[PDB]
Structures are given as C-alpha cells and as structure tokens.
mmCIF file of N, CA and C and ligand atoms in Angstrom:
data_model
loop_
_atom_site.group_PDB
_atom_site.id
_atom_site.type_symbol
_atom_site.label_atom_id
_atom_site.label_comp_id
_atom_site.label_asym_id
_atom_site.label_seq_id
_atom_site.Cartn_x
_atom_site.Cartn_y
_atom_site.Cartn_z
ATOM 1 N N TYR G 1 0.846 -1.228 0.000
ATOM 2 C CA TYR G 1 0.000 0.000 0.000
ATOM 3 C C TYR G 1 0.871 1.265 0.000
ATOM 4 N N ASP G 2 2.134 1.139 -0.404
ATOM 5 C CA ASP G 2 3.042 2.309 -0.575
ATOM 6 C C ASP G 2 2.756 2.953 -1.915
ATOM 7 N N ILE G 3 2.131 4.123 -1.920
ATOM 8 C CA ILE G 3 1.728 4.770 -3.199
ATOM 9 C C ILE G 3 2.909 5.496 -3.838
ATOM 10 N N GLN G 4 4.087 5.502 -3.200
ATOM 11 C CA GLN G 4 5.308 6.071 -3.839
ATOM 12 C C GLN G 4 6.197 4.992 -4.433
ATOM 13 N N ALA G 5 5.980 3.702 -4.106
ATOM 14 C CA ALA G 5 6.975 2.648 -4.396
ATOM 15 C C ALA G 5 7.218 2.504 -5.920
ATOM 16 N N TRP G 6 6.228 2.835 -6.726
ATOM 17 C CA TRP G 6 6.340 2.669 -8.197
ATOM 18 C C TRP G 6 7.570 3.388 -8.721
ATOM 19 N N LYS G 7 8.020 4.478 -8.094
ATOM 20 C CA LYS G 7 9.045 5.310 -8.732
ATOM 21 C C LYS G 7 10.392 4.563 -8.723
ATOM 22 N N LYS G 8 10.799 4.004 -7.596
ATOM 23 C CA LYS G 8 12.029 3.204 -7.562
ATOM 24 C C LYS G 8 11.833 1.922 -8.384
ATOM 25 N N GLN G 9 10.639 1.350 -8.372
ATOM 26 C CA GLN G 9 10.396 0.119 -9.176
ATOM 27 C C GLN G 9 10.621 0.453 -10.649
ATOM 28 N N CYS G 10 10.152 1.613 -11.082
ATOM 29 C CA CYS G 10 10.388 2.048 -12.479
ATOM 30 C C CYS G 10 11.857 2.376 -12.718
ATOM 31 N N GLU G 11 12.545 3.001 -11.804
ATOM 32 C CA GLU G 11 13.980 3.265 -11.966
ATOM 33 C C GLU G 11 14.715 1.949 -12.180
ATOM 34 N N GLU G 12 14.386 0.947 -11.362
ATOM 35 C CA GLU G 12 15.012 -0.396 -11.417
ATOM 36 C C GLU G 12 14.744 -0.995 -12.797
ATOM 37 N N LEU G 13 13.491 -0.951 -13.242
ATOM 38 C CA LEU G 13 13.103 -1.566 -14.525
ATOM 39 C C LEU G 13 13.793 -0.832 -15.678
ATOM 40 N N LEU G 14 13.924 0.486 -15.586
ATOM 41 C CA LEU G 14 14.678 1.222 -16.620
ATOM 42 C C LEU G 14 16.141 0.798 -16.601
ATOM 43 N N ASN G 15 16.729 0.572 -15.446
ATOM 44 C CA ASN G 15 18.122 0.072 -15.356
ATOM 45 C C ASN G 15 18.211 -1.270 -16.104
ATOM 46 N N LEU G 16 17.274 -2.180 -15.876
ATOM 47 C CA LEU G 16 17.279 -3.500 -16.566
ATOM 48 C C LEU G 16 17.159 -3.248 -18.071
ATOM 49 N N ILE G 17 16.295 -2.333 -18.472
ATOM 50 C CA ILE G 17 16.054 -2.089 -19.918
ATOM 51 C C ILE G 17 17.362 -1.559 -20.512
ATOM 52 N N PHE G 18 18.027 -0.625 -19.862
ATOM 53 C CA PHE G 18 19.312 -0.055 -20.372
ATOM 54 C C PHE G 18 20.398 -1.134 -20.467
ATOM 55 N N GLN G 19 20.350 -2.163 -19.638
ATOM 56 C CA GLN G 19 21.340 -3.278 -19.692
ATOM 57 C C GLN G 19 21.052 -4.212 -20.859
ATOM 58 N N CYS G 20 19.815 -4.199 -21.319
ATOM 59 C CA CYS G 20 19.312 -5.117 -22.353
ATOM 60 C C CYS G 20 19.778 -4.659 -23.743
ATOM 61 N N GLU G 21 20.417 -5.538 -24.519
ATOM 62 C CA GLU G 21 20.917 -5.158 -25.854
ATOM 63 C C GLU G 21 19.784 -4.729 -26.773
ATOM 64 N N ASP G 22 18.613 -5.254 -26.527
ATOM 65 C CA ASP G 22 17.455 -4.899 -27.379
ATOM 66 C C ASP G 22 17.049 -3.446 -27.153
ATOM 67 N N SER G 23 17.494 -2.771 -26.093
ATOM 68 C CA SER G 23 17.153 -1.340 -25.945
ATOM 69 C C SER G 23 18.042 -0.374 -26.719
ATOM 70 N N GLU G 24 19.080 -0.914 -27.384
ATOM 71 C CA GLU G 24 20.126 -0.142 -28.112
ATOM 72 C C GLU G 24 19.479 0.888 -29.036
ATOM 73 N N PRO G 25 18.459 0.547 -29.859
ATOM 74 C CA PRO G 25 17.888 1.538 -30.772
ATOM 75 C C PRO G 25 17.155 2.696 -30.073
ATOM 76 N N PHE G 26 16.650 2.493 -28.853
ATOM 77 C CA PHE G 26 15.691 3.432 -28.213
ATOM 78 C C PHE G 26 16.220 3.957 -26.872
ATOM 79 N N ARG G 27 17.532 4.139 -26.731
ATOM 80 C CA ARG G 27 18.131 4.767 -25.523
ATOM 81 C C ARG G 27 18.045 6.284 -25.665
ATOM 82 N N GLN G 28 18.251 6.781 -26.886
ATOM 83 C CA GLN G 28 18.441 8.207 -27.162
ATOM 84 C C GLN G 28 17.484 8.551 -28.280
ATOM 85 N N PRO G 29 17.250 9.849 -28.566
ATOM 86 C CA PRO G 29 16.373 10.233 -29.670
ATOM 87 C C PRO G 29 16.883 9.715 -31.020
ATOM 88 N N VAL G 30 15.963 9.528 -31.960
ATOM 89 C CA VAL G 30 16.318 9.195 -33.365
ATOM 90 C C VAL G 30 17.102 10.380 -33.922
ATOM 91 N N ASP G 31 18.351 10.139 -34.325
ATOM 92 C CA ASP G 31 19.126 11.131 -35.103
ATOM 93 C C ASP G 31 18.403 11.280 -36.440
ATOM 94 N N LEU G 32 17.808 12.451 -36.607
ATOM 95 C CA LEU G 32 17.109 12.893 -37.827
ATOM 96 C C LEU G 32 18.117 13.047 -38.973
ATOM 97 N N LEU G 33 19.430 13.096 -38.691
ATOM 98 C CA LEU G 33 20.442 13.061 -39.782
ATOM 99 C C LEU G 33 20.545 11.647 -40.391
ATOM 100 N N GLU G 34 20.321 10.616 -39.586
ATOM 101 C CA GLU G 34 20.376 9.216 -40.074
ATOM 102 C C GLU G 34 19.006 8.798 -40.611
ATOM 103 N N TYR G 35 17.928 9.450 -40.159
ATOM 104 C CA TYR G 35 16.544 9.104 -40.603
ATOM 105 C C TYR G 35 15.833 10.396 -40.952
ATOM 106 N N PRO G 36 16.162 10.986 -42.117
ATOM 107 C CA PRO G 36 15.720 12.348 -42.366
ATOM 108 C C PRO G 36 14.193 12.552 -42.448
ATOM 109 N N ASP G 37 13.469 11.472 -42.726
ATOM 110 C CA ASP G 37 11.994 11.496 -42.851
ATOM 111 C C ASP G 37 11.319 11.151 -41.510
ATOM 112 N N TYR G 38 12.085 10.993 -40.438
ATOM 113 C CA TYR G 38 11.483 10.415 -39.215
ATOM 114 C C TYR G 38 10.298 11.249 -38.767
ATOM 115 N N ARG G 39 10.444 12.573 -38.708
ATOM 116 C CA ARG G 39 9.391 13.444 -38.175
ATOM 117 C C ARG G 39 8.240 13.638 -39.151
ATOM 118 N N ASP G 40 8.408 13.196 -40.401
ATOM 119 C CA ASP G 40 7.303 13.141 -41.392
ATOM 120 C C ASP G 40 6.339 12.023 -40.994
ATOM 121 N N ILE G 41 6.852 11.016 -40.284
ATOM 122 C CA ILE G 41 6.075 9.806 -39.897
ATOM 123 C C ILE G 41 5.671 9.900 -38.420
ATOM 124 N N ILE G 42 6.583 10.347 -37.557
ATOM 125 C CA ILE G 42 6.421 10.266 -36.091
ATOM 126 C C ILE G 42 6.173 11.665 -35.545
ATOM 127 N N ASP G 43 5.014 11.854 -34.942
ATOM 128 C CA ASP G 43 4.614 13.170 -34.386
ATOM 129 C C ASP G 43 5.298 13.383 -33.043
ATOM 130 N N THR G 44 5.391 12.340 -32.207
ATOM 131 C CA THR G 44 5.931 12.525 -30.835
ATOM 132 C C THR G 44 7.055 11.539 -30.588
ATOM 133 N N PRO G 45 8.303 11.949 -30.815
ATOM 134 C CA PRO G 45 9.448 11.093 -30.523
ATOM 135 C C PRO G 45 9.420 10.779 -29.033
ATOM 136 N N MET G 46 9.953 9.603 -28.727
ATOM 137 C CA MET G 46 10.166 9.201 -27.327
ATOM 138 C C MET G 46 11.284 8.176 -27.288
ATOM 139 N N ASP G 47 11.981 8.137 -26.176
ATOM 140 C CA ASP G 47 13.119 7.213 -25.975
ATOM 141 C C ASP G 47 13.311 7.001 -24.482
ATOM 142 N N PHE G 48 14.110 6.023 -24.114
ATOM 143 C CA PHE G 48 14.220 5.628 -22.699
ATOM 144 C C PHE G 48 15.013 6.638 -21.876
ATOM 145 N N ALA G 49 15.932 7.381 -22.483
ATOM 146 C CA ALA G 49 16.623 8.427 -21.711
ATOM 147 C C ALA G 49 15.635 9.540 -21.374
ATOM 148 N N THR G 50 14.756 9.888 -22.279
ATOM 149 C CA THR G 50 13.705 10.897 -21.999
ATOM 150 C C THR G 50 12.770 10.381 -20.900
ATOM 151 N N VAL G 51 12.382 9.117 -20.938
ATOM 152 C CA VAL G 51 11.517 8.549 -19.887
ATOM 153 C C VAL G 51 12.250 8.595 -18.555
ATOM 154 N N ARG G 52 13.503 8.172 -18.490
ATOM 155 C CA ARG G 52 14.260 8.198 -17.233
ATOM 156 C C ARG G 52 14.421 9.622 -16.722
ATOM 157 N N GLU G 53 14.721 10.584 -17.575
ATOM 158 C CA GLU G 53 14.890 11.984 -17.164
ATOM 159 C C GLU G 53 13.572 12.522 -16.656
ATOM 160 N N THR G 54 12.471 12.186 -17.292
ATOM 161 C CA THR G 54 11.148 12.650 -16.840
ATOM 162 C C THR G 54 10.885 12.086 -15.447
ATOM 163 N N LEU G 55 11.133 10.811 -15.247
ATOM 164 C CA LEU G 55 10.942 10.171 -13.937
ATOM 165 C C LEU G 55 11.818 10.869 -12.906
ATOM 166 N N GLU G 56 13.100 11.032 -13.194
ATOM 167 C CA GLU G 56 14.077 11.551 -12.205
ATOM 168 C C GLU G 56 13.787 13.023 -11.931
ATOM 169 N N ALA G 57 13.191 13.754 -12.862
ATOM 170 C CA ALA G 57 12.798 15.158 -12.675
ATOM 171 C C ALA G 57 11.576 15.270 -11.774
ATOM 172 N N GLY G 58 10.918 14.150 -11.461
ATOM 173 C CA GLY G 58 9.667 14.261 -10.722
ATOM 174 C C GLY G 58 8.532 14.722 -11.576
ATOM 175 N N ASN G 59 8.506 14.344 -12.858
ATOM 176 C CA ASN G 59 7.479 14.843 -13.778
ATOM 177 C C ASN G 59 6.570 13.711 -14.265
ATOM 178 N N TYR G 60 6.647 12.571 -13.589
ATOM 179 C CA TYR G 60 5.581 11.562 -13.680
ATOM 180 C C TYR G 60 4.816 11.587 -12.367
ATOM 181 N N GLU G 61 3.498 11.631 -12.457
ATOM 182 C CA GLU G 61 2.665 11.494 -11.241
ATOM 183 C C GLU G 61 2.391 10.022 -10.903
ATOM 184 N N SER G 62 2.361 9.156 -11.906
ATOM 185 C CA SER G 62 1.921 7.764 -11.714
ATOM 186 C C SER G 62 2.711 6.883 -12.657
ATOM 187 N N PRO G 63 2.768 5.579 -12.395
ATOM 188 C CA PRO G 63 3.399 4.680 -13.349
ATOM 189 C C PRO G 63 2.603 4.533 -14.634
ATOM 190 N N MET G 64 1.309 4.820 -14.656
ATOM 191 C CA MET G 64 0.523 4.813 -15.895
ATOM 192 C C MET G 64 1.086 5.851 -16.865
ATOM 193 N N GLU G 65 1.500 7.006 -16.375
ATOM 194 C CA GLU G 65 2.034 8.035 -17.283
ATOM 195 C C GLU G 65 3.362 7.539 -17.859
ATOM 196 N N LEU G 66 4.224 6.949 -17.049
ATOM 197 C CA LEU G 66 5.490 6.381 -17.549
ATOM 198 C C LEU G 66 5.203 5.307 -18.585
ATOM 199 N N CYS G 67 4.217 4.457 -18.301
ATOM 200 C CA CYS G 67 3.832 3.345 -19.198
ATOM 201 C C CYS G 67 3.390 3.908 -20.558
ATOM 202 N N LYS G 68 2.603 4.987 -20.575
ATOM 203 C CA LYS G 68 2.147 5.616 -21.819
ATOM 204 C C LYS G 68 3.376 6.029 -22.640
ATOM 205 N N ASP G 69 4.360 6.677 -22.034
ATOM 206 C CA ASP G 69 5.554 7.124 -22.787
ATOM 207 C C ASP G 69 6.376 5.917 -23.250
ATOM 208 N N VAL G 70 6.531 4.848 -22.469
ATOM 209 C CA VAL G 70 7.316 3.684 -22.913
ATOM 210 C C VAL G 70 6.553 3.065 -24.078
ATOM 211 N N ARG G 71 5.226 2.982 -23.992
ATOM 212 C CA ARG G 71 4.465 2.336 -25.068
ATOM 213 C C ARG G 71 4.586 3.151 -26.350
ATOM 214 N N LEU G 72 4.731 4.452 -26.249
ATOM 215 C CA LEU G 72 4.933 5.354 -27.401
ATOM 216 C C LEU G 72 6.274 5.040 -28.056
ATOM 217 N N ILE G 73 7.312 4.682 -27.294
ATOM 218 C CA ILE G 73 8.583 4.217 -27.911
ATOM 219 C C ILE G 73 8.250 3.087 -28.869
ATOM 220 N N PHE G 74 7.462 2.141 -28.385
ATOM 221 C CA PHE G 74 7.216 0.928 -29.182
ATOM 222 C C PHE G 74 6.292 1.262 -30.339
ATOM 223 N N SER G 75 5.263 2.059 -30.125
ATOM 224 C CA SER G 75 4.354 2.350 -31.241
ATOM 225 C C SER G 75 5.108 3.166 -32.290
ATOM 226 N N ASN G 76 6.008 4.049 -31.899
ATOM 227 C CA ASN G 76 6.801 4.812 -32.881
ATOM 228 C C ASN G 76 7.613 3.819 -33.721
ATOM 229 N N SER G 77 8.221 2.822 -33.102
ATOM 230 C CA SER G 77 9.038 1.849 -33.858
ATOM 231 C C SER G 77 8.160 1.109 -34.860
ATOM 232 N N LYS G 78 6.954 0.759 -34.445
ATOM 233 C CA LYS G 78 6.025 0.004 -35.307
ATOM 234 C C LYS G 78 5.564 0.906 -36.467
ATOM 235 N N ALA G 79 5.311 2.164 -36.193
ATOM 236 C CA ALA G 79 4.864 3.119 -37.228
ATOM 237 C C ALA G 79 6.013 3.385 -38.191
ATOM 238 N N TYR G 80 7.252 3.440 -37.736
ATOM 239 C CA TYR G 80 8.376 3.876 -38.595
ATOM 240 C C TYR G 80 8.916 2.713 -39.403
ATOM 241 N N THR G 81 8.701 1.487 -38.954
ATOM 242 C CA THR G 81 9.344 0.337 -39.582
ATOM 243 C C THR G 81 8.839 0.157 -41.010
ATOM 244 N N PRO G 82 9.731 -0.164 -41.953
ATOM 245 C CA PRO G 82 9.290 -0.461 -43.317
ATOM 246 C C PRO G 82 8.817 -1.903 -43.449
ATOM 247 N N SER G 83 9.160 -2.729 -42.467
ATOM 248 C CA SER G 83 8.880 -4.165 -42.469
ATOM 249 C C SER G 83 8.631 -4.678 -41.061
ATOM 250 N N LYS G 84 7.709 -5.608 -40.913
ATOM 251 C CA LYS G 84 7.498 -6.239 -39.601
ATOM 252 C C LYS G 84 8.663 -7.144 -39.257
ATOM 253 N N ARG G 85 9.556 -7.406 -40.217
ATOM 254 C CA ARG G 85 10.744 -8.274 -40.013
ATOM 255 C C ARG G 85 12.002 -7.412 -39.887
ATOM 256 N N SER G 86 11.861 -6.090 -39.768
ATOM 257 C CA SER G 86 13.010 -5.173 -39.565
ATOM 258 C C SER G 86 13.740 -5.538 -38.264
ATOM 259 N N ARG G 87 15.044 -5.286 -38.227
ATOM 260 C CA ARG G 87 15.898 -5.575 -37.051
ATOM 261 C C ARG G 87 15.421 -4.731 -35.866
ATOM 262 N N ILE G 88 15.349 -3.420 -36.057
ATOM 263 C CA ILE G 88 15.038 -2.487 -34.931
ATOM 264 C C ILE G 88 13.618 -2.746 -34.446
ATOM 265 N N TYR G 89 12.646 -2.946 -35.326
ATOM 266 C CA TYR G 89 11.281 -3.250 -34.903
ATOM 267 C C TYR G 89 11.269 -4.576 -34.141
ATOM 268 N N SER G 90 12.001 -5.579 -34.624
ATOM 269 C CA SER G 90 12.031 -6.907 -33.967
ATOM 270 C C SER G 90 12.565 -6.750 -32.536
ATOM 271 N N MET G 91 13.551 -5.875 -32.346
ATOM 272 C CA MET G 91 14.109 -5.579 -31.014
ATOM 273 C C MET G 91 13.025 -4.910 -30.170
ATOM 274 N N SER G 92 12.236 -4.013 -30.755
ATOM 275 C CA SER G 92 11.144 -3.322 -30.046
ATOM 276 C C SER G 92 10.155 -4.351 -29.511
ATOM 277 N N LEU G 93 9.796 -5.359 -30.289
ATOM 278 C CA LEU G 93 8.762 -6.306 -29.848
ATOM 279 C C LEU G 93 9.259 -7.122 -28.658
ATOM 280 N N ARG G 94 10.535 -7.517 -28.674
ATOM 281 C CA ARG G 94 11.045 -8.309 -27.533
ATOM 282 C C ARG G 94 11.119 -7.421 -26.308
ATOM 283 N N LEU G 95 11.593 -6.217 -26.491
ATOM 284 C CA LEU G 95 11.722 -5.304 -25.368
ATOM 285 C C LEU G 95 10.356 -4.954 -24.822
ATOM 286 N N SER G 96 9.358 -4.798 -25.680
ATOM 287 C CA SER G 96 7.999 -4.516 -25.237
ATOM 288 C C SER G 96 7.484 -5.671 -24.386
ATOM 289 N N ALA G 97 7.708 -6.912 -24.814
ATOM 290 C CA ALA G 97 7.215 -8.079 -24.046
ATOM 291 C C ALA G 97 7.868 -8.036 -22.676
ATOM 292 N N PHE G 98 9.170 -7.745 -22.651
ATOM 293 C CA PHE G 98 9.940 -7.676 -21.385
ATOM 294 C C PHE G 98 9.359 -6.586 -20.482
ATOM 295 N N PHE G 99 9.131 -5.413 -21.064
ATOM 296 C CA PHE G 99 8.609 -4.285 -20.281
ATOM 297 C C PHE G 99 7.235 -4.635 -19.749
ATOM 298 N N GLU G 100 6.324 -5.144 -20.564
ATOM 299 C CA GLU G 100 4.950 -5.441 -20.132
ATOM 300 C C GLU G 100 4.961 -6.507 -19.038
ATOM 301 N N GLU G 101 5.894 -7.461 -19.132
ATOM 302 C CA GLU G 101 6.010 -8.570 -18.142
ATOM 303 C C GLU G 101 6.353 -7.962 -16.792
ATOM 304 N N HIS G 102 7.176 -6.937 -16.769
ATOM 305 C CA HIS G 102 7.746 -6.338 -15.544
ATOM 306 C C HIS G 102 6.857 -5.196 -15.047
ATOM 307 N N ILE G 103 6.160 -4.455 -15.910
ATOM 308 C CA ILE G 103 5.402 -3.267 -15.442
ATOM 309 C C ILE G 103 4.063 -3.667 -14.830
ATOM 310 N N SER G 104 3.537 -4.833 -15.198
ATOM 311 C CA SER G 104 2.209 -5.318 -14.751
ATOM 312 C C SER G 104 2.088 -5.211 -13.220
ATOM 313 N N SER G 105 3.052 -5.744 -12.465
ATOM 314 C CA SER G 105 2.995 -5.742 -10.967
ATOM 315 C C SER G 105 3.104 -4.304 -10.462
ATOM 316 N N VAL G 106 3.910 -3.476 -11.140
ATOM 317 C CA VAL G 106 4.115 -2.060 -10.718
ATOM 318 C C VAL G 106 2.784 -1.346 -10.821
ATOM 319 N N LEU G 107 2.047 -1.508 -11.908
ATOM 320 C CA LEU G 107 0.743 -0.871 -12.089
ATOM 321 C C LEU G 107 -0.252 -1.434 -11.086
ATOM 322 N N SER G 108 -0.266 -2.750 -10.931
ATOM 323 C CA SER G 108 -1.235 -3.381 -10.016
ATOM 324 C C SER G 108 -0.999 -2.855 -8.602
ATOM 325 N N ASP G 109 0.253 -2.884 -8.142
ATOM 326 C CA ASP G 109 0.547 -2.476 -6.750
ATOM 327 C C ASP G 109 0.180 -1.015 -6.572
ATOM 328 N N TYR G 110 0.521 -0.158 -7.525
ATOM 329 C CA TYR G 110 0.172 1.269 -7.416
ATOM 330 C C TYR G 110 -1.335 1.447 -7.306
ATOM 331 N N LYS G 111 -2.100 0.841 -8.206
ATOM 332 C CA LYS G 111 -3.547 1.076 -8.248
ATOM 333 C C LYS G 111 -4.170 0.517 -6.959
ATOM 334 N N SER G 112 -3.644 -0.581 -6.463
ATOM 335 C CA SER G 112 -4.095 -1.196 -5.191
ATOM 336 C C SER G 112 -3.816 -0.244 -4.039
ATOM 337 N N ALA G 113 -2.639 0.339 -4.011
ATOM 338 C CA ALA G 113 -2.214 1.218 -2.910
ATOM 339 C C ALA G 113 -3.067 2.471 -2.924
ATOM 340 N N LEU G 114 -3.366 3.006 -4.111
ATOM 341 C CA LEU G 114 -4.213 4.212 -4.271
ATOM 342 C C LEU G 114 -5.638 3.887 -3.823
ATOM 343 N N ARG G 115 -6.147 2.705 -4.183
ATOM 344 C CA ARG G 115 -7.510 2.318 -3.769
ATOM 345 C C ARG G 115 -7.553 2.262 -2.236
ATOM 346 N N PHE G 116 -6.528 1.677 -1.626
ATOM 347 C CA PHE G 116 -6.452 1.572 -0.151
ATOM 348 C C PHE G 116 -6.444 2.980 0.443
ATOM 349 N N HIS G 117 -5.671 3.875 -0.166
ATOM 350 C CA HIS G 117 -5.529 5.269 0.319
ATOM 351 C C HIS G 117 -6.890 5.968 0.301
ATOM 352 N N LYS G 118 -7.702 5.693 -0.716
ATOM 353 C CA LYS G 118 -8.981 6.401 -0.974
ATOM 354 C C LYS G 118 -10.151 5.646 -0.341
ATOM 355 N N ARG G 119 -9.887 4.552 0.379
ATOM 356 C CA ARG G 119 -10.941 3.704 0.997
ATOM 357 C C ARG G 119 -11.696 4.544 2.035
HETATM 358 C C1 Y2J E 1 21.393 3.564 -31.544
HETATM 359 O O1 Y2J E 1 20.110 4.103 -31.778
HETATM 360 C C2 Y2J E 1 20.142 5.427 -32.262
HETATM 361 C C3 Y2J E 1 18.787 6.031 -32.080
HETATM 362 N N1 Y2J E 1 17.738 5.169 -32.605
HETATM 363 C C4 Y2J E 1 17.328 5.274 -33.887
HETATM 364 O O2 Y2J E 1 17.951 5.926 -34.714
HETATM 365 N N2 Y2J E 1 16.194 4.594 -34.226
HETATM 366 C C5 Y2J E 1 15.325 3.897 -33.265
HETATM 367 C C6 Y2J E 1 13.879 4.061 -33.657
HETATM 368 N N3 Y2J E 1 13.679 3.572 -35.024
HETATM 369 C C7 Y2J E 1 12.863 2.532 -35.246
HETATM 370 O O3 Y2J E 1 12.101 2.135 -34.386
HETATM 371 C C8 Y2J E 1 12.870 1.764 -36.509
HETATM 372 C C9 Y2J E 1 12.042 0.788 -36.957
HETATM 373 C C10 Y2J E 1 12.588 0.310 -38.151
HETATM 374 C C11 Y2J E 1 13.695 1.016 -38.379
HETATM 375 CL CL1 Y2J E 1 14.776 0.980 -39.568
HETATM 376 O O4 Y2J E 1 13.913 1.939 -37.389
HETATM 377 C C12 Y2J E 1 14.493 4.336 -35.971
HETATM 378 C C13 Y2J E 1 15.961 4.178 -35.620
#
C-alpha cells in the first residue's frame, strides 16, 4: 500500500532495460540526420533516456504516465518500420514483451495502494 513505491520500481526496470541489448535503438532520440523522414512519420518522438529523465525530474505522477511514454517508444518503432521483419522493430517487440512482463505488478501495486488510500 506504498503509493510512492512505483518510482524506484520504475527506476530499477529502466536500469534492466538499459542493460538489455534490445534497448540499443531506443536509448536516445532518433538522429534525424540518419533518418531524415522520421518526423514526417512520427509526431511525438520518445526514448528511454527521456523517460528516465522525466521520472528523475519528478514529472511523472503515476506509473501509468510512464507506461504511456514507454508504449509510445514501441508504437513509434512500429509506425516507422518499413517491415514487420526489420531488425530495430524486432528488437522493439522483444523489449515490449519484457517491459509489459515487468510493469504489470508495478501498475497493479500502485492502483491497489491508491484504492487503499482512498478507501
Ligand atoms: C542507436 O540508436 C540510435 C537512435 N535510434 C534510432 O535511430 N532509431 C530507433 C527508432 N527507429 C525505429 O524504431 C525503426 C524501426 C525500423 C527502423 Cl529501420 O527503425 C528508428 C531508428
């Protein structure tokens, strides 16, 4: 019932994601010099360094907001990919499965703790 615990749980999970080779494409923003059409396709860039900085700045109120930005990393990869068999997109799908496997308990515990708080 700790309604703050999600923040360190997310820091920990971001540390695991940064250790994961599959996060290599989405640590930093897309260099628009290497992908000159990126912003023609993607309205809202997102990456894991931006998510970590937002968290560490105290600019997430809940793990749902962090989850929305991480999911945007993955949806951007899916929107930008020329092929469902692309290397970078394939890395996104594995990393997404990993993230969803790990974030589920963080969301559940937070929502449970908030419900207890508001009982
Ligand atoms: C080392 O990483 C540098 C920053 N990352 C980066 O440039 N990109 C990651 C995002 N992205 C894609 O999701 C994608 C799908 C299919 C193809 Cl190709 O790319 C475009 C490439």
